[PDB]
Design an enzyme around this catalytic site. Structure first.
Site, short mmCIF file in Angstrom:
data_model
loop_
_atom_site.label_atom_id
_atom_site.label_comp_id
_atom_site.label_asym_id
_atom_site.label_seq_id
_atom_site.Cartn_x
_atom_site.Cartn_y
_atom_site.Cartn_z
N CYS A 103 63.40 57.10 54.63
CA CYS A 103 62.78 58.40 55.44
C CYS A 103 61.85 57.70 56.59
O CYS A 103 62.03 59.00 58.08
CB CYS A 103 61.93 59.27 54.24
SG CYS A 103 62.60 60.22 53.43
N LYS A 146 61.96 64.12 37.45
CA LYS A 146 63.21 64.12 37.33
C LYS A 146 63.56 63.41 38.72
O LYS A 146 63.72 64.07 39.63
CB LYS A 146 63.25 65.99 37.75
CG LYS A 146 64.99 66.06 37.73
CD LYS A 146 65.70 66.35 38.97
CE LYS A 146 67.22 66.08 39.49
NZ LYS A 146 66.66 65.00 40.05
N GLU A 182 57.95 65.82 50.99
CA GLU A 182 57.63 64.67 51.65
C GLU A 182 59.69 64.66 52.10
O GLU A 182 60.24 64.25 51.69
CB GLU A 182 57.39 63.51 50.51
CG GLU A 182 55.67 63.28 50.51
CD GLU A 182 55.02 62.45 51.07
OE1 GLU A 182 56.05 61.27 52.48
OE2 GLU A 182 53.84 62.46 51.93
N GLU A 231 69.45 62.74 61.60
CA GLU A 231 69.01 61.80 60.84
C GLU A 231 69.71 61.13 60.22
O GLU A 231 70.41 61.63 59.40
CB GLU A 231 67.70 62.01 59.38
CG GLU A 231 67.65 61.16 58.73
CD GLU A 231 66.16 61.86 57.76
OE1 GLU A 231 65.50 60.67 58.58
OE2 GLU A 231 65.74 62.38 57.44
#
Ligand SMILES: CS(=O)(=O)c1ccc(-c2nn(-c3ccc(C#N)cc3)cc2C(=O)Nc2cccc(F)c2)cc1
Ligand SMILES: CS(=O)(=O)c1ccc(-c2nn(-c3ccc(C#N)cc3)cc2C(=O)Nc2cccc(F)c2)cc1
Lengths: 492, 492, 492, 492
Positions: free
Chosen positions: C294, C184, C260, C391
């Site tokens: 990331c 997806k 992840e 972040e």
């Protein structure tokens, strides 16, 4: 599919630094059609003069900063993948060459030999960027890791029974690790190897990475075997000649040696096996490729209760085996490779007759042109007979008898050859008992010649040193370099 | 610790089948103390008759269904763990026996040699039941797996540089894999191996699994090499004898061969390093074990900026190196092993003075009693000098100069050997470029001969074939057998 | 290379059973150009109904005796190689799609993302027939081996920062092991994933092996996370959503979980390093792909000796960084993905100015259309400030100073995020010190964002479970089965 | 060996930092012998305050530069081998206190549970120094390697049916990789784990490397799951709690989760096997350890030809099993662990007599000499009974009947559990097809429950996540860190 009509032989010269070269002596040598005897063409005959040039090119292609040395490991794999594509495109031409040169039946060279070649190049193309070293937790304040490097110039010598297939099994793992290759195909069957030089140039391999030199054993081969600039030699595969390969390796510059030598492989048929399956599998185990395989096959031990029935149907199967022209899709068995092989087989056939073996069928040659031999079966063979030892590279099947599993194991191991074995039974205890007790590098259970690009291959005892195919074939063409760094910290 | 007082040599016989025997001829050879020239004792001298009986014992101890074969691999490790305990118990005696026999200082023999001997056994004690094959996902309805079986009877020949360490490095992996051993210690130093036979019997190894045969090289070693009943020879020694071992394997048996030959190893010291640390480490890279090391740092390359400074501290410390009895706790350098090597270390140190080399200290001897040689330093050596090209197994330190890193890399790899190399620097780029550019099996950064049971060894070119130590040391005493089983379906 | 001019968006439907289906609800959702804000097309919206059809399609394709389960492992690699061939032909189209739908600069999508997509499929094309089990030497009369079988149906959820590359990174290892996939893509960027559905059907993948379901998180994603017929889930995205994936797995069927989750990756610049190299590399590690990585080096620790001039050089580099249309070859930085991310970045920039950070340049949105933001640099960003903790997925560079390696090591590790690290230095000891003493899945030395198909990569703490890529990525998609056979005698 | 006469529970306190502490509350919980119902002793009851104290101890012993971190990996192995020595020394003491606590026959706990414990510690003593990373040949001017590093603080929660065996199987691999441990034994049987704390400090492990926290599940067990200072959890227990464990983990800090949940393992028996061997291994397949095993062993299918002869010899062996006191040497079956476990299986025994299934013997108990349930044998059970699908951890055998190999494979795979399987036959193709078609992590052929130290053990489907007790058990306790270094040039 059908053979290429007429078919032109474009490539008959020496392949050095991706250029086609004449021999320094100007000599040539003929190549024959073993089915008819006709001279097919002539090839440049390489000698020590040409061998020195190829080693010179292979060394330059291996020096630091070279395109081949710098090339990303994944890109060495892409080149191998590209080569496999050109082989599949010319699958019909190369199969025709193998038939015309080696006497193999066409549909055999197309669906077996050529299939193995393509799959070998594809398999090793994936191994290129996956050849891993290790990091090792050593005592003290040190960081120790391991690098796998290419050894360098790799001289390779291949035989005539599986010319293109042996050519693939030799260069694919060597190029996978980033070596440079100087390869001499068998003088009888150098055509498919020389055509490979054209595809290699087409694929885009840097110059001098692969140098193909057709020529005779005592000339080109002995030049390779004792060359001081060659670091590794790989030979296939007469146990007699292999003694000198490893002899000249130690007297020259101490090359690393790989051997894939002969064998007298046993084939045990227990009475509780699929009978119709075993007779056909033991027949194809002996008669495939005109009996010209190191993985035969010759000694077939059959349990006494089914011995007379096994012999009966083996004789029926041998008598109906169609021997004829290789270009004929009905042919199962082509000719032998040459007169010397042809003579040696008929001699060994006559030794069995002159020693008490029951010649059930065949026994002599077929026709007048070429090197065709009848499919023959010797019954009541004993362990002491001349045909019991001595490998016979021909269509001669020898059926022994035995009682007790402990007896067949001792006899099947009582041999200086340990390349291959095969057992046929439906009892899992019997199958794993025998297979673990066999002194052989490859043991098949309820099959024969089940070879693949994924499974390593090679023999015990005097059947060879080292293994080809699989991951373990990569260990022949690498050199481990350990690097130890003094660490200030050292933590887990 | 302290050397064992008034220690008697209890074991001087020949160890076959866990028993002590005399020579079949009755011959006997003496063993000497190189610090003194005294005759230490007399040991039986084995030969072809005795070697044949060792192979018979080793072949039976390896027989199918034997105790050594059916034994759980985990107890093979506990048998090797037990040997480590007995060595740890009798540690002072073995370090004493190595000092009186090999001429090493007792404390170094205690803290260095035996520490590695103990570690090597405990290390390979854990590998015994962790030797793994593989199941291969293979084309066609088949199930293929491999099993790592021991080769068989392994003949091993070790030198006198490290009589006990080389003994451990040889038998530890061999027995760990499940092999039997026919091992021959050096003529000069066979005692530490003969005591191991007692610990072997004490530990509980079945009779015949380890056969120790003291004797002469051209007499007993050649009997091991040419024995048709030995499946593999592993040799450590000079490169010239290693060529014969290579030739003797191809002439007869085609046995697998692992060689470990000479050195003449470079030692590159850069300017950005710690001179105090680099000087001592390079000093211990030459003079350790009285200069008798295959991994000796023969040629030292010092950067042009710090060369004359490097020689100053080098010669300075080299005058303080105490040369005395290998039993005095202050002693660091013992004697050379015997007279043949004593004279050789001097004929070539004469070649250094005879050529353009500039002696800076020592070069003669001490009179003394045994075979003691002065700690000698050389300087302003050129690459073409005989001394910078001859493997000197003596305490001589040749110190060169180099300008750029590209030059020192070419000057370092320009030699037919390739066991060992070392770099001293703090630059990350220079440390990695040089470490990868070297053509040696072991490269050290900011250290020298820091070896361990973990990590392999090594190394390249005409210095050996294969690797001992680490995991890869096991791969030379295993045998890969492929088993393919025809299956009806194959899913996953 | 140039973008495809006026691009047709042909594939906008759900991909199930190698067919294009409409949504059972009949709904569609829009896709936007992040650089202009205008709509691009409408995609069928997958919900729990469409997810159910995909699961039973993938479950059926995984059944015993199916085409996908009986196919040779080498052929699973052939299909992956063909898929990589189809990507390289349509490389310009897919790079145009990703540049259109993701805001990436075209040339960077063509040369980085599309390159990694091809290299990933090629790398894993080789691993297929090379996933090996082991044979284990266990105590007692037994034969123990292991098979690595595929787990089954794998649900996978991928983010929007690297849509095509994350698509390859997820399906390549899963297919390599023989699993079936229900994937997806992120609702913002589903297009390039849907184009891959056409290449998959063209490549010849059996129906139901790969099913693509574009939709939203709480609808398509949530239905995948809690499906009882799904054996494994692989999520890549925010740490917050990563907690809900591992939670829903425990509540449903204990499906295996891969995560992840990114983090706050530090970058340490020592004064020993090449300054102009480090300035450029650390600036690339912050601003690459609009800062939406990331692995972004959000916290750049710089030694105080070079802090003030590293900062100045970085400000000059940021002020000349070219922001513009993704289709223009001079553009280095495109827009952020949407308004939600755009605002979150602008609010975090305000927190930096509020908490007392030196906004050296930029710091505000650029233009009226799209979601472009100026390159932004901060300074003296103490560890307690919000921009230092949270972040940021935007072009915001944040520079800290430090005094001691031991200090910067503790500060860099002080975080629940442990995904990636980077140290820049020319001393080997300092490079070994930090890299071994950090809690990060990937440590780059004197480089940044050096990702490969051969290297693992993954999170240490709250940055993920397990790894992808390399050999280790394969072990997350394989069940290990152990088979143990009672054998008669057993001979090791 | 006889049980220790009057053994006193010397160790009753919580083990933290190699010290005995009381609970922060002062609360204690009583431990009972289920073969007498009498309270044996009292143990300090750990909870959150004690769990937080142990984590802080476990985190300090893992902090960088600690003794446990800097210690050589080989000495980590020596510490494990030292523990195995002390266990074999106190083998009698640890045996009787396992019969007193767990309720197993003393000679079973001496020759099974202890043999597995000593072998487990000694098997992982060798792995410590042999955990290797890998160097990767990646694209570009890079040198990439990986390090296998310990995760950190690991929380473990063993069950009650193998208190000491599960204790070793948990801490041995964890400590092998260099982790710190916070382990909670079962509230039913905590004693033998506590004694191991004494053997731990005796062996010399640094304080805090392993902490033993006796307590309850909903109290101290949940404090381990939800502790944000624990990087990884390993459960082993019921499937229901294991679902809750992965929810508590995902809700907290994304700690890595490995469960061992067990279930309804099938056992197929074909008519061509030795009935004497088959019925006996099927008896001990579900009757061993009083039926309190995850394998179990539950659903036993039998071919039609031998079904009504299977049950005859089965009910013979059932009513022949000499139940009694664990210390009596002639006793084969012991008591169930407590009354609630005793009460649930009787509630299920009636869930067969009332569900239409036929009983053959047993089904009650023997009084209240403890919690004893007599050997019970069922028959004619169908697949959708509550008996043939649920958690009967008692001595209940369920003999089913099947016709076709195809049919029983569907009926055996039709289970959400599926941790283990077993097939009895002599047919090579049957044993291979069935063993490959099973959806289990372990499948035996002509044996059952043959667990060994060298072979990995884990569960498929929902029983569930992760592998232990082999080489692959190490993977569960290690973190992979990739290190990539920019180098000046390739050369490969
Ligand atoms: C192949 S070889 O015969 O040429 C040779 C070369 C070097 C050494 C050696 N040398 N040293 C050394 C020690 C101290 C100093 C100083 N100061 C200098 C050198 C240590 C070793 C060594 O192997 N250790 C070792 C350690 C653990 C396990 C094991 F199995 C072996 C030994 C033989
Ligand atoms: C995961 S579990 O909790 O479900 C479980 C299942 C089976 C056993 C088990 N059971 N048996 C067993 C013994 C005798 C009879 C009989 N008669 C039947 C079964 C032996 C074992 C066993 O592990 N051994 C073992 C041996 C060597 C090393 C090692 F690490 C472990 C233990 C726990």
């Amino acid at each position: 599919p059908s053979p290429t009509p007429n078919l032109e032989i474009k490539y008959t010269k020496i392949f050095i630094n991706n250029e086609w070269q004449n021999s320094e002596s100007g000599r040539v040598f003929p190549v024959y059609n073993p089915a008819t005897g006709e001279q097919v063409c002539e090839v440049q005959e390489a000698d020590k003069a040409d061998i020195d040039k190829a080693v010179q090119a292979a060394r330059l292609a291996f020096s630091l900063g070279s395109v081949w040395r710098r090339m990303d490991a994944s890109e060495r794999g892409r080149l191998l993948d590209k080569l496999a594509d050109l082989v599949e495109r010319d699958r019909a031409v190369l199969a025709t060459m193998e038939s015309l040169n080696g006497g193999k039946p066409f549909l055999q060279a197309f669906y077996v030999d050529l299939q193995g070649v393509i799959k070998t190049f594809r398999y090793y193309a994936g191994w290129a960027d996956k050849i891993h070293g290790m990091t090792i937790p050593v005592d003290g304040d040190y960081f120790t890791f391991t690098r796998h490097e290419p050894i360098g110039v790799c001289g390779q010598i291949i035989p005539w029974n599986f010319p293109l297939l042996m050519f693939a099994w030799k260069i694919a793992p060597a190029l996978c690790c980033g070596n440079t290759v100087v390869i001499k195909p068998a003088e009888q069957t150098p055509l498919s190897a020389l055509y490979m030089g054209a595809l290699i140039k087409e694929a885009g391999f840097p110059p001098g990475v692969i140098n193909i030199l057709p020529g005779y054993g005592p000339t080109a081969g002995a030049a390779i075997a004792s060359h001081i600039g060659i670091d590794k030699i790989a030979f296939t595969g007469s146990t007699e000649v292999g003694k000198l390969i490893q002899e000249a390796a130690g007297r020259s510059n101490l090359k690393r040696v790989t051997l894939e030598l002969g064998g007298k492989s046993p084939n045990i048929i227990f009475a509780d096996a699929d009978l119709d399956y075993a007779v056909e599998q033991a027949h194809q185990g002996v008669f495939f490729n005109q009996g010209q395989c190191c993985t035969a096959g010759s000694r077939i031990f059959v349990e006494e209760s089914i011995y007379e029935e096994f012999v009966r149907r083996s004789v029926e199967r041998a008598k109906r085996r169609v021997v004829g022209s290789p270009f004929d899709p009905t042919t199962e068995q082509g000719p032998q490779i040459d007169k010397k092989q042809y003579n040696k087989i008929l001699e060994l056939i006559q030794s069995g007759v002159a020693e008490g073996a029951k010649l059930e069928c065949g026994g002599k040659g077929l026709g007048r042109k070429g090197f065709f031999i009848e499919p023959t079966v010797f019954s009541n063979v004993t362990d002491d007979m001349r045909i019991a030892k001595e490998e016979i590279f021909g269509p001669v099947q020898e059926i022994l008898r035995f009682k007790t599993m402990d007896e067949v194991i001792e006899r099947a191991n009582n041999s200086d050859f340990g390349l291959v074995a095969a057992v046929f039974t439906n009892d899992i205890n019997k199958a794993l008992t025998v297979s673990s007790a066999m002194q052989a590098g490859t043991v098949w259970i309820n099959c024969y010649n089940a070879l693949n690009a994924q499974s390593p291959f090679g023999g015990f005892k005097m059947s060879g040193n080292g293994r080809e195919m699989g991951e373990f074939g990569l260990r022949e063409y690498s050199e481990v370099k350990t690097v130890t760094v003094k660490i200030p910290q050292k933590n887990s």
